[PDB]
A paper describes a structure:
Initiation of viral mRNA synthesis requires a direct association of FluPol with the host RNA polymerase II (RNAP II), in particular the repetitive C-terminal domain (CTD) of the major RNAP II subunit, to enable “cap-snatching” whereby 5’-capped oligomers derived from nascent RNAP II transcripts are pirated to prime viral transcription. FluPol binds specifically to S5 phosphorylated CTD (CTD pS5) and it was proposed that it targets RNAP II for cap-snatching in the paused elongation state, of which CTD pS5 is the hallmark modification. Structural studies revealed bipartite CTD binding sites on the FluPol of influenza A, B and C viruses (FluPolA, FluPolB and FluPolc) with notable differences from one type to another.
Although sequence alignments and mutational studies strongly suggest that the mode of CTD binding is conserved for all IAV-like polymerase, we attempted to confirm this by determining the structure of a CTD mimicking peptide bound to influenza A/Zhejiang/DTID-ZJU01/2013(H7N9) polymerase. Previously, we have reported crystals of the A/H7N9 core (PA 201–716, PB1 full-length, PB2 1–127) in the apo-state, which forms symmetrical dimers. Here, we soaked the four-repeat pS5 CTD peptide mimic into co-crystals of H7N9 core with the vRNA 5’ hook. The crystals diffracted to a maximum resolution of 3.41 Å and again contain symmetrical dimers of the polymerase core. We observed clear electron density, not only for the 5’ hook, but also for the CTD peptide bound in site 2A, essentially identically bound as previously seen for bat influenza A/H17N10 polymerase. However, there was no CTD peptide bound in site 1AB. The most likely explanation for this is that in the symmetrical dimeric form of influenza A (core only, or full trimer), both polymerases are in the so-called ‘dislocated’ conformation with an open active site. Due to the dislocation, PA regions 425–452 and 586–618 are rotated by ~20°, which particularly effects the position of site 1A binding site residues Y445, E449 and F612. This likely explains the lack of CTD binding observed in site 1A for the H7N9 core, whereas site 2A is undistorted and occupied by CTD.
Numbering used by the authors:
A (entry chain BBB): 1 to 182, 209 to 634, 657 to 670
B (entry chain CCC): 40 to 107
C (entry chain AAA): 203 to 716
D (entry chain KKK): 8 to 18
Write the structure that this text describes.
Amino acid sequence: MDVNPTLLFLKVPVQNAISTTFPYTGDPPYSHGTGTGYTMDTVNRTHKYSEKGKWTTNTETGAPQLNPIDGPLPEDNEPSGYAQTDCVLEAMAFLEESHPGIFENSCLETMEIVQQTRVDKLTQGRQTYDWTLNRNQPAATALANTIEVFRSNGLTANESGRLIDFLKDVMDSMDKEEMEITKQRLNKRSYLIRALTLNTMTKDAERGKLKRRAIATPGMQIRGFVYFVEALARSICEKLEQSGLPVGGNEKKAKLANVVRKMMTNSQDTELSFTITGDNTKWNENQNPRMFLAMITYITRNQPEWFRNVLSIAPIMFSNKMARLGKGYMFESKSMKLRTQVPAEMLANIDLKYFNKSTREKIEKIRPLLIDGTASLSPGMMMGMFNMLSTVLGVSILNLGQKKYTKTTYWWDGLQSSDDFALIVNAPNHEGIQAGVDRFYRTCKLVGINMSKKKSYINRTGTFEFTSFFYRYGFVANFSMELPSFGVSGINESADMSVGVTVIKNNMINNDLGPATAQMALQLFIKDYRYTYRCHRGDTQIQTRRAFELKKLWEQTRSKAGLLVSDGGPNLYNIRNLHIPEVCLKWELMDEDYQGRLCNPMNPFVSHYDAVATTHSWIPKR
Amino acid sequence: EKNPALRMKWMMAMKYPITADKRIMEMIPERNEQGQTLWSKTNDAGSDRVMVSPLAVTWWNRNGPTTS
Amino acid sequence: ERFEITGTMRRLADQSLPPNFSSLENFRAYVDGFEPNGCIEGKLSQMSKEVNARIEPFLRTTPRPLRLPDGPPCSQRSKFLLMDALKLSIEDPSHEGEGIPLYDAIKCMKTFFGWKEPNIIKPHEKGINPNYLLTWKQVLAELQDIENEEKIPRTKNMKKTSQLKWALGENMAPEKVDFEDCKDVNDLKQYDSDEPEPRSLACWIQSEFNKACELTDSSWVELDEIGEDVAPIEHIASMRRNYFTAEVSHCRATEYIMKGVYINTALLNASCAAMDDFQLIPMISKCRTKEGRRKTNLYGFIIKGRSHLRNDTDVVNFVSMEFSLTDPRLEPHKWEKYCVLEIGDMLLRTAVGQVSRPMFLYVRTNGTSKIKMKWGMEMRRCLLQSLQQIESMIEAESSVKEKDLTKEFFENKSETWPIGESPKGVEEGSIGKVCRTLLAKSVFNSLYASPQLEGFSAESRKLLLIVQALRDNLEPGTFDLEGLYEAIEECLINDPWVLLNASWFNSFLTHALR
Amino acid sequence: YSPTSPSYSPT
RNA sequence: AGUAGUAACAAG
Ligand SMILES: [Mg+2]
């Protein structure tokens, strides 16, 4: 007999044993070298889907800006960047109709959020691009540099503490004709090229992808506004039922039955219901910043002018953005045995006879965009963080699925969260099902939403997927979507326990770790923990340096259960305990003279997640 | 390496990976009764502290001052 | 509260508008006074009728088998031997913690007295074959040199000899020079970024995986205790878990899980501390026998080259000298990258006579990275995923009845699960076999991890889900079925593991559409 | 006899 | 050589 796990699906429904189609146990695909080549592909593709737009030259920047909006209505089933304003505005309008006041209220709740938000909020971010150094830096370090270079260039409105008042400094910085870094002074033309910058690196640790991708990170000028934009978008998405954001799996599981119920219970015996397991292709590259401006300006109708301006800035900055190329390329001399890293700036003016036939093609096509050796990307949304506001748009089409707006035999509802969606089409006959599917697909193409024909499929309502939640006649997945290392955390005996125990708890609440699996996670954690800190239970024969000391303590102690795992005690944790600090959990069980030492604040080890102050809370050498 | 987990494992394998105040040398004895050395005379390059073995932590918890 | 769009900022804002709106305040006016009037209805009637989502009906007839690439048979890329490995073993009734591996290894080596004058059998096509044989001789020799040393070393750093300098790639990279000092060179072109050379599915990758699902005579994992089962869920949890941990305890894949950890852990430590030393790292795993006594095993030795790792991607070269009874001349295509020696004769006295099989050594220059080593150390999550797959499968099949089917699942002692295929057709196995299989898969997903796999899994899943919808009688339809295939097959290049996982899909599809 | 882990010396 | 795969590592 030759084994073939795939043959399980003969007995088992794919949805049930779908857990078995994920290879997340070995190392992920990491990109080696420089993702400079991968960026130029993203730039050259973005400009291809928008080709037939109008080319402008920026007044401040001098960037070749392509605008595909209101462009030629596509004639093929290729990815269209040509979205229509009247169509996007109609969608927003018909949203405000179906959800009375949705924009009115969101604006009010977001205005409060604008007048509260501290500059502190910017520090809570990913590997941002610091214009102060022209380097990718920590979110906290990049802000501190910016506030300092802003303080020394006559801008301390951030001193008030509010983010809104920092954003004023960002506005006022654009005007100053020279900006000096502590000492290098750059003109207003070369500053704005730094403010409107997206730095690019290849994406490491990305599964379900053969070839690597080019992700981009923005400067600390844009960051501030995008938060406020996403706050408004969030405020709306909270009020929208078809939105899968920002809710957790707890509510998201329910949302699948919530929507299937609507389309099945209504439908009489003479009414077909087909669910399409959806996914949109080139999402980021095919949504134009001007459309998000167009959206925002419609949402902020009858709102204070200051509020409109604040939100309006992000998409304007994104519409005039410039993408840094990367680290560059490497060259190898087969005869002389040499190597050399050519920085990406020099791709502008360099021999084309050095590169190969495919890599030469990309270098040529991007050249006409190169200003300060940083290619401009006026269209598209190269890994933009408008995940929420992009959901508002997506939903606004699902909204147009009511018999009211279709005015036909067929109709639709669904779920949206950024690029991923799931749609149910109801109709009396098969022609209506097709006509409805076409209607949606085309109504999407009008707002630059290009459904992937490859990475999607349709079927009778009952089985489908949305954001990797595999639905089957009411039952939803219920397995772990990415597992962390359940090993030692690398702090100290007392801390590592409280961390590692909580880690497992959090995965059971959020990620949906199975109870039995959680117990094995605990089992594995304890194994690693005991091994690392040589704190094997006092009754074991295992031999470490600490063995004797623990053995003696175990021998002396009356209430064994009392002892911490750190002191050769037994592991008392289990699914119900994973939220109690070990010292608390084992408090009542301890020997008086034991805790009288363990907790004695007169200990030499401490100088002086839910931490408990013990002799275990020591500090490692450095 | 930069990974804390790996670092800790490497650390614990050394004889004296724990930092503690010089006062420990008066409180606890230099050697356990089997002979195992608990703390070292090596001074800390940063503060008024000395190098200590995880055995010291365990020793304090079985022989040490009982305060209610 | 005030916030105004300034001079420089206004001039930008005005350029970032839909075409023929030459001012922001101009545009805002249009938006503010916009009342919709069949704009979409009109633009749709306008737009091309070529643009649409035509529904290709998915019938039992429509799906063809996957297109497996043609070319040379795929080779072994696994860091260490799996089904081919051999162990020199000793009993360890010392209950010792982290006993010094060098000595465990020597004590193991001393148990065998069948060594020969090493002679090359299957030579490495592109390598200085005599260098390998020399390396093994140096290893053999330097382990004796210890025995006559005034003190005893805790770890042996090998002498940087001609052979070891070649096998580990000492000074085999081009020298980094600034562009100014080598700009005008005749053949200064970019690094070769070609397609991986396409290889055909060899029959051995299946044979390797078949032995992964095998049970052994030894207990390969020892998990620590947890608190008493009180809460209702905790009983079910510990029931599920204890059953699974029984079927998996003795599984060969579990030996691989430990083997990988024991190697990667030690390799990554030596990689950090002994950056410039050619450290000898012996390949050791420990297990409990049928009887219960502790047993220490040696699979061979790994000499690590220079380990200067700054990036997680940056590579460390090593040499995998591994003991084996497998004659390499049986499937020499598998051992493409390996140079195989004949390093002794073994004598086994069996109940059917005196068997005298010969002992080989699968020497091979290999590499790994910090990331690849780190994920080798965290191989035990294979058990967690493996258990997750069962737990989820039970959770589901139980939710329809609204009654936990755990005890029913395991206690049902009847071979019911389609799991393998013989020439007879699909063969049914037991939940026990299911567990071990689902583990083995998860292990090989770690051992043979590759973007090809990552991608194939992701795309094939889609087609797999489509196929199920057909079996559910849910009138399935695709939009671009061919496109889906092209995306799947794009990943089927040269990875034995991927090619097999593809073969399996074809195997399934055959029986799925019947 | 087990080709992976066979007994090569007597006891 | 070898890792690796659309560009890197084979120390600086
Ligand atoms: Mg989907």
